[PDB]
Structure formats: C-alpha cells, structure tokens
Design a protein around this ligand. Sequence first.
Ligand SMILES: *CCC(=O)Nc1nc(OCC)c2ccccc2n1
Ligand SMILES: [Ca+2]
Length: 689
Amino acid sequence: SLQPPPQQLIVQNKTIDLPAVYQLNGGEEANPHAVKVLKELLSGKQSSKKGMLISIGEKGDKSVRKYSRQIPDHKEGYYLSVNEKEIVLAGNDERGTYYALQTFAQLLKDGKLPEVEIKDYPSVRYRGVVEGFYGTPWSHQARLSQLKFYGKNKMNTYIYGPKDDPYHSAPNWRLPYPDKEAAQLQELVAVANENEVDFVWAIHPGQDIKWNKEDRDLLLAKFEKMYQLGVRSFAVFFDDISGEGTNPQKQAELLNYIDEKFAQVKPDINQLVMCPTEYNKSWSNPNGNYLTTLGDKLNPSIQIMWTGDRVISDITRDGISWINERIKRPAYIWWNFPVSDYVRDHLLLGPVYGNDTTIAKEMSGFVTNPMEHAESSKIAIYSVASYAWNPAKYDTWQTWKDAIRTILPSAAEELESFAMHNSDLGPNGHGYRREESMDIQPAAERFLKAFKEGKNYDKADFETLQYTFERMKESADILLMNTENKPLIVEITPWVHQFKLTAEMGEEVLKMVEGRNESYFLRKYNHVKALQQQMFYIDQTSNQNPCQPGVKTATRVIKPLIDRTFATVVKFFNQKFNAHLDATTDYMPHKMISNVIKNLPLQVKANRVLISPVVKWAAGNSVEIELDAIYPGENIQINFLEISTDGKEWKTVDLKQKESRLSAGLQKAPVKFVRFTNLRQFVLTIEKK
Ligand SMILES: *CCC(=O)Nc1nc(OCC)c2ccccc2n1
Ligand SMILES: [Ca+2]
C-alpha cells in the first residue's frame, strides 16, 4: 500500500530486479537529499558507465530532459518510472524529487520493483503537524524522530508551538532561547531541512502583548534571533488568550508589519501564518466583525488557521465554506486530533476520519495537533499525511492499519489489538468522541441483555468475549516487552498495564457467570476485588499529571460490559444465597454515607478526595466522608461543616465565600472524617505522598 497513494499510478504485472550494475545520470545535479536516499538504496550495487540507466533530476536538469512532458507541473510534483529498460525519478522541483525517492523506497521489496509509471503531486499545499498542545512538550529525541517520519510521508510542515515552552508563550516570548535550547533548535532546523520539512517557529505573545513600539520591536528581534538559528518560516498565534491581544485590527497590522519589514526583506522566508483568537465557528462573535476584519486587512500571502465549527471538530464542506467567505482566502486547517491535552488519562490511537475528502481546493494547509505522546501520535500523523496528500483516495481503515504496520512491524497485530480499544476520549467539555471496540460491541450488547433478563446467552457471544480478553492479555504482554520502538512502549506502558488488568478482570467475571459452585464463585469474586484494587493503584501512581491524572483504557464498551456483568452476577448471587456481597465496580479506600448524594461515588485525584458532581437537602440531613486514615488537611472547597479524627469529637470549620465558591483552609489539622449538615463541587485536599 503506497502511502500516501499517488495521484496517478499504472502498474504492469511484471517485476525487475534492482539492477546489480547501474548507470546514474543526474547524481551531481539533483536534490542532494534525494540523491542520498537513492545511494543508500543502491548501497550493495555497482556504479558503472554501462548497466541499467537510472536518471534523477528536477525539471531543467540535463539528466531528465527526455522526460519533461511527463513531469507534473505542480509544486512538489514528480514522475517516477520503472521498466526493464530504465528507472526515472524526476521532480518538478527539488522537493518533488525527494518525494519521488520516498515513493521509490516503498516500491522496492526483496530487491525487486514493479514495472510502474507514476505521476504524483499533493492536493493540499501545506501538510503536517502543529506541536501546539498543553502539557509536557516533545523531547528533543522525539522531535528528531518526528522529522524523519514527516519526510517519509511527504509532510512538508512542522509548526513549533508547545504551549508550555516559556520562550514560545507566557512569560518569556520576548527573550532569546538560552544557549542549550538554541543549539537544539538549530539541530531541529537542520534535520527538518534534510527531510524537506519547513520548520515553522511560532510565537504566542498575546496574553501580555502591548500594542506599542517596544513589544513590536522585541517580537521582530526574537524572529531575527530565530532566523539566525536557521528558521525560515514563522507564525504568530493569538489562540486561548483574553484582553487587548485579541484586537483584530492590531493583530492584522502586526502580521503585515512582520511581512513588510521581515518576510519581504529576507531572501528566503517561506510560510507566514497566524492563528486567530476566534479560531472556530462556535467561538466567533455572531454580531461582530473579528473575522471579516482579519480577512480584509491581513496581507493576502499570510495564512489564517482554523479548527472547524468547534474547538475540536472535523472539517466539513459547509464549515470550510463558512470560514473561507469571511477570511477571503482558503483556511489553513489546525485539526485538533489526536491531541489529548484535555483528556490526559486517555490515549487516542484510533483511525483518522470525519474530514471531507473533496475540499482540497478549499484549504491552504492541513496540520494535526498531536498528543504529548509523540510516537503514539504517529498513527494519526501517518493518516493525516495520507489524507492531505490525496484526499480523494483517502481510505481511513486501510491507512490506520498501514500506519500501525509501519510503526511497529514486529508486533503490528498486538498494537492493533491495543489501539482498537484505546480510541474514544470519554465524556468531555468539547463533546468530541470517537468510535471504539465496534467489532465486539454487538456480541457484548446481546450477551448483556440475555444475562440481565431470564435468558440463555449465545455460547458464541460468550466465547467472543473470552476470545477478546485472551487476545488483550497476549497483546499487552507482547507490547510490554517489545524493543523495536522502545520510546513507543515507554509512552503506552501505563495503559498497557491497565489494559491487561481489564482483560484479567473480564476473564474472572465471565468465570463468575459460568456459575459452577458457591466456593468457586467466591474465589472469583475475591480475585476480581483484588484486580479492582490493582487498577486503582495504577490509576493513582501512573500519569499523575495536573489536569486528568491516571490511566483509563477500553472505556467505551469493554469496561462498562465487565462492570455491568459483575454488578448483575453479584446481585443474582446475593438473591440466590441470601448473601450480601458488595457490587461496587471501582475500588475506593475511603467511604461516604449520606441521608441525601448517597450514591454519588467518591473519587481520588492526586491529594484530593471528592464527591462526583438539582439536589433536595432536608433539614438536619448530612453527608459524611470517612478517609482510610488520618491525614493533615489542606483545604475544603464546596460549590452549591465539621471535621474529626475519631468520628465522635468534632470541630467546626467556617467557610468563606466569593460568589458560589465556599472554601476553608485546615492549616494541617488532622482529618479522618468530614461532615456537612444543611453539588457542582465537594473537594477535600489533604497532605499526601
Ligand atoms: C490542565 C492544564 C490546562 O488546563 N491548561 C490550559 N491552560 C491554559 O492557559 C495557559 C496558561 C488554557 C487557556 C485557554 C484554554 C485552555 C487552557 N488550558
Ligand atoms: Ca537540479
């Protein structure tokens, strides 16, 4: 599967050997980055004045003069030909030549090539990745790896804008990078250039920019320092800010000044891009002219970015028509997937889909905002590269599989098994979801209805569930030990552990359903309870980020199936044997009781213990939380109060107020019980770890 698939391809059912003796024409006149690829591929073979002719060059070079009519007249276009007589690798321009060699490399298998003729070019002018997320920015080693990946997949754009880089954003955007970081950035630029990628350095100054001479000049001096490090494309982002920096006329004037005084004065600046403050339809003022002001005032060579109809959105024909009318140019898409920076407890390893495949002419560019997990994001990146190059031939499912096979050839089926059940976001404030576990969902839902009611489930369905859990454990164990992509495995490991425990829990729960005798059932029950505790421990000790800590996996179908089946089989057991087994599905070491609320589960997040968010609260009614030990208390925050260490001797804590927010410091007071007498928020913070 050539990826991206070329615009035009004609294959014969005929094969030639990569020639043992070859005559190279154009080695000194073609793109040296393409020539390097070709020479690596011909490493074994003999350069002669006789032997099979291989011609490499750009249109205008002597080497490819015979083939000038076959070369597409498109930016980054190429013509590739292999037949028994000769090989031709001819770009319309130097990057096109490089791209011809990336296609050529995929054609070559077991020292053999198909007889083929290809004419190829990208449908979208700028294709790539915006490292534009909140969280731990990609490591330098991760970035190196990404740039090589981009060249292989014909992505020509890498926009550097990690929100947590203080020399990119708040507070130190005005300052030059310190020496260590500057040398790293210089190396990234060099490697980008070697992989035919434009390194676009972005700046995000808007939260405290002053519309005065001093800050204008400081921005330009920072761009100049980045130009000294080799940067030749630049962006200015005004997303996710408030205040004076949101002014569109001033934004447009700044970008125009950058254009006039910098981008028009250097010999070799390529992209100049801005991200607006109103960067999706839902954030656009209905009766405001923010977007029309940018559209009319911004110099027409300057690109304008757009995330779609919402912050997290798929791009439609109606949506892109809507923006294009107002900005007076084709939008440069900023696609917010697989970015997980608002659902940091989930990996998003599913296919890329949802974007209209007929709107290439309506977009200037398409870049993906990835996860902070760089290797894991390659699944989606590979897919976006395929989409943006040839959207008319974009096959979501086959591209997903191809990506996985590319990224982890040694354990591709195991990675697919894992990714199939790690693709949904769970519930979130952006409303954005993806499909997950679709294949087993029918068997899961049939089984669970039959089970709940008074019905024999289908043996096949039970077996499909067993098969799934068995395969999950195989995939987890194989992935954990895989050393072909060690950085990938480091990223996903906490989720792999959680996924394996999920599968184990599933297996034990099905053994509870198979219901042979009382003492066996209880053994399975006790084992499930232990596995629940293990899953709680992973959740509290892994991926303890400040936003959405912990580790969730197989959340759409699998975990709900297991949890519902467990609750049901425990209910039946209690009914049948007059027992009182606990039917709770998530382990929770702390306890809460209430007359009101009563069945809202407690959560533990970092050093917070909280009740899960109209409630009718009678007089003298109370909520009581018992912790599992005595801890020093930090504070209590409540949004519509006593503490103790033994439950008997109490002490009152007076809440302060500002709007609906109630709060009180506890000054390290020992706390085991918290009681309120007479909910968007109920959170105790303790001293932990
Ligand atoms: C958990 C991290 C988080 O919420 N990050 C975040 N930060 C900012 O502000 C940058 C200082 C932000 C602004 C607007 C929208 C979302 C945001 N998320
Ligand atoms: Ca040339």
